[model samples]
Target chain A: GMETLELQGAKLRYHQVGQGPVLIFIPGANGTGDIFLPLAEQLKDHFTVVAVDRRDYGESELTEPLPDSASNPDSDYRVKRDAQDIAELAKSLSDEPVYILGSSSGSIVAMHVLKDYPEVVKKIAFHEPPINTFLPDSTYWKDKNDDIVHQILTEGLEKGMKTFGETLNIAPIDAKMMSQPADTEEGRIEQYKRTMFWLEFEIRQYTHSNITLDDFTKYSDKITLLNGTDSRGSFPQDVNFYINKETGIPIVDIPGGHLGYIQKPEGFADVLLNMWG
Target chain B: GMETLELQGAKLRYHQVGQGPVLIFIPGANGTGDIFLPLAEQLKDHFTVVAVDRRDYGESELTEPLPDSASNPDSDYRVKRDAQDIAELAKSLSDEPVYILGSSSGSIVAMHVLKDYPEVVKKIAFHEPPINTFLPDSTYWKDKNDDIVHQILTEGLEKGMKTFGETLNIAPIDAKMMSQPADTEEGRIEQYKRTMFWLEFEIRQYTHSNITLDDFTKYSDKITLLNGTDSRGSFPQDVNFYINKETGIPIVDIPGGHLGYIQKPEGFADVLLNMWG
Candidate 1:
């Protein structure tokens, strides 16, 4: 069932499944609880799975006097505060220390939770944490995402979608894959439309925040660096390298690239379950 | 699984289920295709259920030039033009005549389809069409809904909700229920907020449409007026009574009140199934 908890300054929106040790699944750019539905469905038999929508996204409406991080600092966007929200949610849901899994920006959120509230976590997994700011060329992705917002708002969505596909290297440039009216078989077009509106909040705030390489080493034994062999980007690999060089943590491989959990949830679940075991 | 069609100057968003005869479910005031999910899930084994969202609502994003009904006469939204959209959708989906079930204002749309495009519809079932304009006290409801729009935009959503609850007789005349931050057990508060923003579109457009008694008599044999024994208010009953007086159409009774499908989908589906049988 889905539930909302009114915390000190904000509301936490989450949905839970199963009856066992807790496993929290944090969504990336979409920031909605439903994004983790497939993964939760696959993992529910083994652990109590809870998925969340971040503030001002999906069903998680923000109350007035918006959170300090909402639009305050482009630098932090309250990653530490959001992490605390997740940690508090974990504590309220179960007595046991919870296992956490997050992909993309969600991974960054989970990383901060690992930093701020290590006591509440049993294990943590960050899959391609998009920590490009830690890389030498941070603005490469930042400039591209900036154009995506501009193009979508001022020009049109299809043009921005094309740039998004190219910027992320999500697909080949030839097909005009992102721009075409969606064929019925796969519902990605609808998903893209639903997802496109929030890029301004997601891209700016979630991307440039600083994640210290040394900070990850402190919880090396309790952490797993997850990556997809198919994901095409050196930025995230360097992110893994920084953490791995410091912590000597295990880097586990899942089937599909950056968005592997969404692309192949059953395969992704198998990898995650083995880590949990 | 899901599909879209490029209609006249707009894209039609729709989804289909099951395998037999086609049954299209048009969303009411919520303007989202997913509202009929429970009924669709229940009856899919017997009939193909297709739910569609109107423009500027749900996953159906509004494109330019919008629709003719989007702003016409400034008071009574053209239900007939929207019915044409549904007719074209049915034609695009299959060659067979569609069995349509429309609740609340959705029923009004279905009624219009029967008028302009009788060839597109098979047996139509209207569960509380809310055709109050035919009544003597049409302006009574119109003025109240107009106040709801004014109150929401100026005063606030909670004030509008209280007025709407009183105006519709949907809830007790008390602030306790309307003002409370919706807790997890009921997600109606979120629904209320989402619905509140579109009050201008819904209250005026859906309410003040013209539907003649002669129109009902024409399709009397092909249509069924459905009412709930549990539904409050005599407005809808008189609507059925008018149709019955003109066409000798028997008013069929369902289990619950006006918004019955949402309140009790399983029971409502059984009633729909029998009519659709």
Candidate 2:
């Protein structure tokens, strides 16, 4: 079932399926809940999987205009607001604590939920959250990210995406293959808008958000760090290592790098299931 | 001449020398204005050099007991407060904008002053600020630093200092040779308290303090990043590169590593003079 929950000033779109304990899935920079459909399908029989399209992505919509980036750069796109959305959604779904699995930037959102609204989370497994601040060389990554945002803002979306893709080490052909734009012209326009929103608004805010060692260690019993076996030496994997080392959070290997769940849903599901056990 | 300035909840001790444009010197974690005495002597003819012992350092004293570290961890030490001290000192010293030089952690303070009180600063030079957040592997440095703090807190000052020195790659003999403890029993006790204060209260706060690209770039014309020629591959030198690269701020190399001004004041002063011209 696809449903909309109205938040403070935004409406969140989430897809729910399956039948046991509630498990919320958060998407990365792609921002759409649909990317988790295959993985959700595998877990549906064993558990109730709820995938959310964060505000400004998929069918989710903000009721009011975002703070003007030109006039006020620092005030825009706080990751805490996104976490509040998830906490509110969890409250709507069930009174009990819920399990959460957030991949990439979504992992950051999940982390915030665990930090700010710890009562709502039963257990959380963050898959390769690119929390650069957790790394020794965070400044390098922060600068690199700032440049990416600058490129997108000044050079146009295509050039920005190309630079971003290069930074992620994703080949142009591979990136094109991974992207599945909507078929209809109107639908494609919406998709384009979503992509732009992620690039222009979300990327900087999400990546730059700070989560201290204390934040993670405080919830050590309830948090786990996940990495992809095939994604060794990647930024996400490196982040996981630092997080694990610093916070003593367990790092469980899944199937592939970054988009592991999308690429190998079954294998990802298996590892996650074992981890939950 | 040495004098005292009363600030809110604190008394700052500062030494003044030189005779031209007002120039303030901020020392790092060593926290003594006296460290800049030699360097200030060199620049006395060209500028009125005001070297300040930041609050809680050297003769400078916080009037009240520090907020209980047991009850409050985050509120104890702030780099901004130190900057405020410098700003007030500058206002006391000169009506016109003052030229400022900060070394190591003091560099971080200088950057903050330029960012927060730009009107009070004519041009500022920051030498080897160990701003871990600026590095690509900032997490590594931050974690390493946190460990140093933990060692000091849990073990003893000796253990923590050993770890800290190792991280900076400072040899034990070199560290001992550099240290000049007080001769008298009472004086030695005060010095020990100051060292403990720095290890327990200052190191984490100063090293973890952040100065963004925009912070430096906004005052690019009025800011310069300096490095020590003898400090290649050192953390501070590495940080200078990242700051210079990101903000396009010029980096001028002086004579020695972290303690360039103290080690080779004449050569360091020469570089500072050339840069000022």
Candidate 3:
């Protein structure tokens, strides 16, 4: 049903629906591009949404596959490298400026994309990016990596995914446990699977360990941090607080919670479009 | 057993706890004095917290009780009448000037209280207040009310209460619900019932009418509207958008949704108290 799209040295699989502005949906840990589907449907009236499957998840793979270890070559799965993957994808996908949206861990990926290849993106919307570690004291970006390691060691994959999801306030299935309606049960379960898979891939590859809140600070003026109002646990507030403070850019809120894009797509998309103008 | 405390041509019941500056809590439509418990616990640690059921809910009422009917003799349910209830409650509850807090329907009552008895309330904190009726072209709020009306006509009291709870993004309970571990069958069920029963009281008495945004705008300095970041639907956002548009006072973002205080009470309290000193 889908085919390969070329990004410099990487083979990527992506699907496009609608026509207007170009929106590139970047996968977080799992590399499943489907999470952004509902949002894409809503933006279709004004933009063409291309769901980008990160390398190793779908058709995309590094050239000359080598050992999973980075020391061994062929492990081109670095945050910076993958961000450039999207930058190149944006270049190949459309001539029109693209709006890039990402949630949770994917959000940090979007920021990295902006840092390296922002010219390819017109606007970026982040849904509760869990880029912090301990938030108040330690460097959250690095600390989050530590938490991931701890989860990997202590809780195993599925448990780790649940823990990470809860901590980041991502995962609709988890939220549904509180609200008790399966608005997107099938997709939520599947996404949970891919999220676990994403975490595994994240362990293999490196996302952001060195980047601090300061990295997002400078780009705040250049990008809009899309935070959701109904998110408290690890709401984008932790990330946006530093970004808004350091950059003086407004921390504009969108509808829904961590996975707002999917749980309540209509509400999310309406407010998101409003953020545009 | 609760008994009435006398005020000028009114009967008020004041519940006081803790010490320091006073905070006056006003109840929503058909809201009893108890609706403020969670918020009261939040503020009681640092300052005295007192809530008035405000003429209809809980204990506060007019000198002469209404004939068993929901209808008040003179709209003691009217804006000004409700404001005086808060005024008297504040007078009886504390010696020091008190801060005011209200949510949903009660927020409007807070404004009215400040308008008529400005000296009574030291400061005001409005949580997702229903000031939409006063705003121009606010069919959105009315649409929400209409949905409730349909529920009321078709589903009756219990279902309507459940829907109202959902409307505020108040998380529901289940065997494995997120808050389940915190709330048991009896506890969760009771919380649900009291809230529902109170809301039905509101739905019946409120007619859910307008309050004129102009009135909200007039006392911008005296009021501070707080919206939850993880609130239900557009509640936090609508209140955030319209209130800010009408008044210069920023709609400060708190921790959770319309029922944010309940889910993220401590964080919500911290932000609310920051306004105090």
Candidate 4:
């Protein structure tokens, strides 16, 4: 169910299921790759779904401890770091280029993979990437991401997570799909640790993504900008609009909103399958 | 500085300052007219500014008590009720048509005045009118609004207010402008009461406004859609975009974000004055 790979200073854990051409599932801010299990299962018949937990998420372990503060020079949780992990995983999974699908912040990581390790990625589908840097109000978003991190540091994780959830505009329907890892006490503690890690170490760096449309344009042929039919006015949709307008990249609509893959895995899979063809 | 007027079942309180053609100011969900004092002072030389507290806010008094719950038949906190209050205030202020300016939810009331009592308004400027019903994702917003109200009832006021503030995307800058009625314990109590009232009675009804662009088309000449230069990717900005696209009404940019009047009163006043002329 789970496999581990040792990277430069971390051990990556991923759930590898299914068969055929390799398809990697990179999750976003939710922090764990297991959230994609349902979606992976749906696509398993035709694809080898590799859902990898990024550096500080789930079973993934950093050999060296993260610095006490993100401001510390040693606390390098940059998107490129996560991107490199995916690239290595993709390379390890298959000799040929592997298909990569990333949702939300994971989508940002997937784009970086396409940019930095284009040789390993056959095609990349990014669903609702919060690449706010591409937006006209990039400064506002950057400030917002910084503010959320500040909230986590100053106020508390609960307050910060509340703000983060609200900022994400998770619809009641989509929110219902967001379940804790398990109902046990240990699950709660694990979820809390992962969430705090995401808020402190990952959110600001990932959302304020430096990866521009120019980077995507280099591998434009291999990029598919996935948008949710329900995510009309969201930030991700706005980013997709800009990406499509600038690069003439077609935005393919999937079933649900930003968390569509988890909410409507079968429908999401159908869209991906059709797009892959 | 503060004045009161008795209407059908409510005694509305307002701030009357300045000295020329009447310009009635309607305050939004912050639920008080005092917020406009700074902006009104800026426009005092050219216009007589009358900033009115809506039915449940500030010194305004509803003669009859509201129902225990919004779902109750007696609980009637519709936009039309607020519009009626403004219309009566406009009529009481001047024999001739009066200039109207409403910020946020107050802007919705201003638009309703133009729709139902066009003769009373000389010209209207609505800054960031959160008339989300105009947008493509109206249902999503409506649900979000409803969820906030539900949060207030089930979770508690602080939790609900947090969600509301986050949903509004109140930038760190604009949030700084949001102050309490006074520095005392009474002011804190007053603020809590107003916020609870707004959540339970006003937010859902005002935001899920049925007022269509077609309603504005009838009084298009008298209407000026005001946007903030800093409010890109916001719900109000999206609404303004749709309003501009559908009705061909120009969206003039003000200096600051949604709370621009308070944030940059002089710049906001300059924009309004230029538009008015």
CA RMSD of each candidate after superposition:
32.6, 34.9, 32.4, 33.6
* Tens digit of per-residue lDDT, candidate 4, span A1-277: 5799999878999999888888787775445677667556556666787888877666787776444343321222456677899888878879998777665456556656666567786655434334443344545654554453333222354543354356555455544444334586444544544443333222222222223445445545544556677656654455556666887767777777655544565675465436531
Pairs of colliding residues, candidate 4 = none
Per residue, candidate 3 scores C-alpha lDDT tens digits across A159-268 of: 33344345445437535543332357444433333333222221111111122334334333333454556664452345445445755756566556544434455565
Question: What is the clash count for each candidate, in the order shown?
Answer: 1, 16, 21, 0
Off by over 4 Å in 3: A66-77, A133-136, A139-141, A144-148, A154-277, B1-277
TM-score between model 4 and native:
0.31
Question: In angstroms, how far off is A54's CA in candidate 3?
Answer: 1.0
- List the pairs of residues colliding in candidate 1: B231-B257
Give iRMSD, candidate 1.
34.5
lDDT by residue for model 3 (B1-277), tens? 4546776555666677666677666654335556455545545556666656555344455555333222211123345556676777677666656676554345556656655666665555443333333233334434543443333222343333344334434434211132232246554434433333222222221111222345445444444455557643442244335546755756567675433333564675466435421
Question: In model 1, what is the error at residue B252, expressed in angstroms?
Answer: 76
Over 4 Å off, model 4: A1-277, B67-76, B155-277
Q: What is the lDDT of residue B150 in candidate 2?
A: 37
- Candidate 3 CAPRI level: incorrect
What is the TM-score of each predicted model, taking all chains together?
Answer: 0.30, 0.30, 0.29, 0.31
Predictions in order: chain A TM-score: 0.50, 0.54, 0.48, 0.53
